[PDB]
Design a protein around this ligand. Structure first.
Ligand SMILES: *Sc1ccccc1C(=O)NCC(=O)N[C@]12C[C@H]3C[C@H](C[C@H](C3)C1)C2
Length: 148
């Protein structure tokens, strides 16, 4: 049998599986802190807390250009009323993409963050990425709130 997984630093393990049927997405999420390298290899958490038991789950990723091998390349299809399945081991947590918008760069304080939240996965999918100069023309923020 299995159990509730924890969030380690090792990026070889899978703590959760991100599955979005509308976008045919079925990709492993790489648990741990955010590192520039790993965020170019797949999707990892932005939260420094090893707790996936918390209601605030921030995950970071990158958009698609020439490479369809990014875990959210087809995220363009998914709508604000689709189903985001965050599978932790065997437990399937369904979230709805209630809050979707692609905002402008520079301003990280475009939205006010607080600890008064619901169960939401806060995915930071930068809709651009030049590693050379370290720039991105857009940050597409996607917040999925837990459904029952
Ligand atoms: S998209 C990207 C890629 C690499 C480094 C940094 C970023 C980036 O733009 N991140 C900043 C960011 O999204 N900041 C937050 C701050 C608050 C309010 C929003 C949602 C979340 C908590 C991340 C924007």
């Amino acid at each position: 049998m299995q159990a509730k997984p924890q969030i380690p630093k090792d990026k070889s393990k899978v703590a959760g599986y991100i599955e979005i049927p509308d976008a045919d997405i079925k990709e492993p999420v790489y648990p741990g802190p955010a590192t520039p390298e790993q965020l170019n290899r797949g999707v990892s958490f932005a939260e420094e807390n090893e707790s996936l038991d918390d209601q605030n789950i921030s995950i970071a990723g990158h958009t698609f250009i020439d490479r369809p091998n990014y875990q959210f390349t087809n995220l363009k299809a998914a709508k604000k009323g689709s189903m985001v399945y965050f599978k932790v081991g065997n437990e399937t947590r369904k979230y709805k993409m209630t809050s979707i918008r692609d905002v402008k760069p520079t301003d990280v304080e475009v939205l006010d963050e607080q600890k008064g939240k619901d169960k939401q996965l806060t995915l930071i999918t930068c809709d651009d990425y030049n590693e050379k100069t370290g720039v991105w023309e857009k940050r597409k923020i996607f917040v999925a709130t837990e459904v029952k």
